[PDB]
Design a protein around this ligand. Structure first.
Ligand SMILES: Cc1cc2nc3c(=O)[nH]c(=O)nc-3n(C[C@H](O)[C@H](O)[C@H](O)COP(=O)(O)OP(=O)(O)OC[C@H]3O[C@@H](n4cnc5c(N)ncnc54)[C@H](O)[C@@H]3O)c2cc1C
Ligand SMILES: Cc1cc2nc3c(=O)[nH]c(=O)nc-3n(C[C@H](O)[C@H](O)[C@H](O)COP(=O)(O)OP(=O)(O)OC[C@H]3O[C@@H](n4cnc5c(N)ncnc54)[C@H](O)[C@@H]3O)c2cc1C
Lengths: 603, 601
């Protein structure tokens, strides 16, 4: 039959995209190679982290699932980097791979207008650069208005272990092959990225005696402003949480890796690294920091019913023989046994630059990319892209105009922007990026920042938006209050900026305090941070000014006065939507930008 | 008339290349836009540093000048990173920009077979992919066998200040334009890199009262195993040295820069950094490190007779008005005045991958690139490339075969390899690279490691090689000695590994201290490190085994069994010379490498 939107992929990106596009009312066909793998978590057994955490909340705020999901199936939540402030924190729960998968799968089945299909999409049918359909490897064709590609680590994937190559997209699964011809056919740049993962350990064979413990936090935090408790962002003290364990590599582990560097496809270059704990393979951790003698390693539970341990911080592509020797050089694992070997995955990727901040292909209309296929890596980073892609894919199908998240309003917008404008040299991660609005884009205000875009599209219930609209309205009342009261003589509001929690203001000064968990921790923040937020908003006024100046999708970049010839072209290939964006293009200089502003400064 | 080798460039790359190519006996035409700028130091007023230092010694050991140069014209030497060991140290002297320039200039004039030319080369004449000549912007042509391009920051250069563009290759100088058409004509990939430099301050307007002092070291070190004292690597205590001063930025400085990031072509990349002390601009240290509140700044003397201060760690491309406000927000510079504004330079560069480890273009025979035109940045990193390029350009001209420095024998080889094999995304620096033989490629054994390649080519005097061959032969004798003597009863040799300097072995155990200065500090090292050096040599045996397996320049990468089709190609475009090298190519995997090793058997 026919479809409005076809989502090639059942992964994280696929889901969010498919769900949204459907929830917005589009007949959505979500293709998958193996239905039983819908929502499968293939690497670290956790959702959230430094930057990731924030993203989730946004996806949640927007009406996506990833939030709700990790919550109901999480087995160990906690807030990271607690000794710095509330704005610079981020939630990172542990997950039950099994239950998570089942969850997401269940949702997709039970979602109106979302039809699942287990056929490998091989081609994209295009008439005059407009998506018209999709064709599977079973000689079947389908009529669709929009397509959202999210192949992740599958397109012509190759598993690397030792010096062995094995066709596939994930250890044990097949791979996709056909769809790449369509891409080379139309001349999209194709490049390959390869990432690694740690093997899987036998819990039974590990010695958890002389090892630290990383419990969750009580009360534990929650990734959704929709789960129970509703409207809140926390779990009632006393929830069941599992424990992770910590061991460290040793001088011997290294000598082992070193001895076999010529046997691993993850032996990157010898360049002074960004940080011991920013590098992927454990092979880098010793190539880039030839002076550190031990790196932290997180043994993580993959679920409740499983004896499978995840040795976080130990991904590699060393021979399997070697993989044993080195896993057993670690304290606690001297007798461990592997259930699945660690390995490396290489896969086809189409440079983000080939898209607009709407995630729509510049060359073809109706085609949207997202996920690892977009140069990213991580469940979250991928999820973020999906929802945007899906939302737009929908609108594109519906006959409306695509939307986009500004880099100064959602940490997602940041990613999508850093991607469609600066491209990628290696897999793009979030805990690598920074926001020129690190204080306005917090891990809490998220719901407030995006909730409206939500209700606007439909991804958010009418009733849902009111709880937000209502909760917020109240957050400012309580603030206008502390602003007017006094205590020299300062304002209670002005107090939060002096290590004054709305809890010390209730005791030391016997004042009232908000009676809804969110409004209290929210009002407490906004007031403690309102100053710094402004200094920040100010130091960027100029930047925002640009980001606010729109550039027509028709202007001829030649009719532009005193605009270098070289830049005339980059400006035609990126077709920036805002002057600000146009200024972030590498090559386009302040000089060029002015000459451009002048042009527009007549029109 | 005609030439064997034409060296387009009078910069550092140009020099070493030109000098060598000529010293080896080739009619060498070294072209320059402005003769008075031969050997001009355009950025930091110093030679050496973390990685750089070592390179120099190598170029010195090979017969290049840069070493000798910095020595006789240096105004403040010193060894960096002294609290870690002797192998992990590196010499970094301050220079007298003026004196240095004059020096190198002098040398080139007085060098047999080296003819200077102040004409802008515009084209390279090629018949059947073979360099046959060069053509200047004056409608003149020249017959040459080889060409060594080293345009540095000039090919279609553009100076950026605030939002102003100014054609040129350096503040105040012109630029090159024509030569780039030759490159696009033949399909070379052309990309642009831009770097920045700090302005220049009026020494008279600075307050050097409440600021630290960074004197040289006594005795100070020397970058040449040829200057005085000969054979040694040290200067007799008591030499004249200048002093640098240290101030730090302030929270205000930053708010200034921040306020003006929309007016500086150097702002970009919210990516987390590798350390503040590693970024170029100062507009970075406040974008990549939004939490640090003060960065060290080294006020450095540009010479003896000059009142020009170099604010190390403050390069920027901010408007000139802003440049004032932010230079005057710094402690000591509240009243300073600028002589030259700081700025940014953007310039044409042809991706290194377009060359072999011999620095010869893959597409055209007889054409060699080097310097910043090759994706590099820095006097040293550029110098290193030149000498190799020149050496080969020579041999190519002479009708012999090009040579190359292996990555496990010279830190230079490292650079050249990191470049011709992994290409560049941004300007390549040395203090960013690491060597899988950090202990065997030290800042002293250099002379020993390369000396022979030197005499082999001619760049080193016959009598020069003997001093080396002789000094070395003696370094081992004295070792054979400490190895056999005892003390339970360990060996004196085995003692150096226990914080035993051949100085404590002369006092505490009344033994004999070596003949001359080098043999003493050398034997003292080699013995203190002989262990670690071996553990290292071993952990890499496998890697070297590959690096030793040679790949014929003829083999059809198709006739190779079970070698993925995608890799068949990359292996065609890099035409690796070594299997080891072939393994460093991004894309070529251990899988592919084995399938290859099988083929070759
Ligand atoms: C080996 C390995 C290493 C990793 N390393 C890291 C890391 O270092 N850091 C990090 O953050 N994350 C890492 N990850 C996580 C990775 O980012 C996610 O696993 C996932 O691939 C990203 O989400 P996605 O939605 O793009 O794709 P996926 O979740 O992988 O889903 C892709 C889906 O597309 C379908 N598909 C593929 N081709 C076709 C086709 N032609 N037709 C129809 N359907 C198709 C598949 O069935 C699959 O369901 C790693 C994963 C692996 C497997
Ligand atoms: C703005 C700026 C920023 C810098 N930043 C850094 C930094 O961050 N870190 C660092 O280590 N170093 C930095 N440097 C130093 C720089 O790397 C060296 O000055 C130089 O580029 C390296 O040596 P070279 O021989 O390749 O080129 P150059 O020293 O530039 O010399 C090239 C020579 O070739 C001649 N020439 C050019 N084109 C032609 C032609 N077509 N025909 C004939 N002759 C020609 C010129 O006259 C010139 O003398 C910077 C320099 C500048 C100017």
């Amino acid at each position: 039959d026919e479809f409005d939107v076809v989502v090639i992929g059942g992964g994280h990106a696929g889901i969010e995209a498919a769900l949204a596009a459907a929830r917005m009312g589009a007949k959505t066909a979500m293709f998958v190679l193996n239905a039983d793998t819908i929502g499968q978590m293939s690497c670290n057994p956790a959702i959230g982290g430094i930057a990731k955490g924030i993203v989730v909340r946004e996806i949640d705020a927007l009406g996506g699932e990833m939030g709700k999901a990790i919550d109901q199936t999480g087995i160990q939540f906690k807030m990271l980097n607690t000794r710095k402030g509330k704005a610079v924190q981020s939630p990172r729960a542990q997950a039950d791979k099994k239950r998570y998968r089942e969850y997401m799968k269940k949702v997709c089945e039970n979602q109106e207008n979302l039809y699942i299909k287990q056929e490998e999409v091989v081609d994209i049918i295009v008439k005059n650069n407009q998506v018209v359909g999709v064709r599977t490897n079973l000689g079947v064709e389908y009529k669709t208005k929009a397509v959202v590609v999210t192949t992740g680590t599958f397109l012509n994937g190759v598993i690397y272990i030792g010096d062995k190559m094995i066709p596939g997209g994930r250890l044990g699964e097949p791979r996709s092959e056909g769809l790449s011809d369509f891409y080379r056919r139309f001349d999209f740049p194709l490049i390959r990225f390869k990432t690694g993962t740690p093997a899987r350990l036998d819990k039974r064979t590990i010695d958890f005696s002389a090892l630290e413990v990383a419990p969750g936090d009580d009360p534990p935090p929650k990734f959704s402003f929709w789960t129970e408790p509703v409207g809140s962002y926390w779990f009632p003290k006393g929830k069941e949480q599992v424990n992770c364990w910590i061991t460290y590599t040793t001088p011997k582990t290294h000598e082992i890796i070193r001895k076999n560097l010529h046997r691993t496809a993850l032996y990157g270059g010898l360049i002074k690294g960004i940080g011991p704990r920013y590098c992927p393979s454990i092979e880098d951790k010793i190539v880039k920091f030839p002076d550190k003698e031990r790196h932290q390693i997180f043994l993580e539970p993959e679920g409740l019913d499983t004896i499978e341990i995840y040795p976080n911080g130990l991904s590699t592509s060393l021979p399997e023989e070697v993989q044993w020797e080195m896993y057993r050089s670690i304290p606690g694992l001297e007798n461990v046994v592997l259930i699945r070997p660690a390995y490396a995955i290489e896969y086809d990727v189409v440079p983000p630059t080939e898209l607009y901040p709407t995630l729509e292909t510049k060359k073809i209309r109706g085609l949207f990319h997202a996920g690892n296929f977009n140069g990213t890596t991580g469940y979250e980073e991928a999820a973020g892209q999906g929802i945007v892609a899906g939302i737009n894919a929908a609108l594109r199908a519906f006959g409306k105009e695509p939307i986009y998240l500004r880099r100064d309003e959602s940490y997602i917008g940041v990613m999508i922007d850093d991607l469609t404008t600066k491209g990628v040299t290696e897999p793009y991660r979030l805990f690598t990026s920074r926001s020129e609005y690190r204080l306005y884009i917090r891990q809490d205000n998220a719901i407030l920042r995006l909730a409206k875009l939500g209700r606007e599209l439909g991804l958010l219930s009418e009733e849902q938006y009111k709880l937000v609209k209502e909760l917020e309205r109240e957050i400012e009342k309580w603030k206008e209050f502390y602003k007017s009261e006094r205590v020299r003589s300062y304002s209670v509001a002005t107090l939060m900026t002096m290590n004054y929690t709305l809890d010390d203001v209730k005791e030391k000064f016997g004042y009232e305090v908000p009676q809804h968990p969110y409004v209290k921790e929210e009002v407490e923040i906004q007031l403690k941070y309102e100053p710094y937020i402004e200094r920040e908003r100010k130091l960027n006024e100029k930047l925002k000014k640009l980001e606010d100046t729109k550039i027509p999708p028709d202007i001829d970049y030649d009719k532009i006065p005193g605009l270098t010839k070289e830049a005339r072209e980059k400006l035609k290939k990126f077709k920036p939507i805002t002057v600000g964006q146009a200024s972030r293009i590498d090559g386009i200089t302040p000089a060029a930008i002015t000459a451009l502003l002048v042009y527009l400064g007549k029109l």
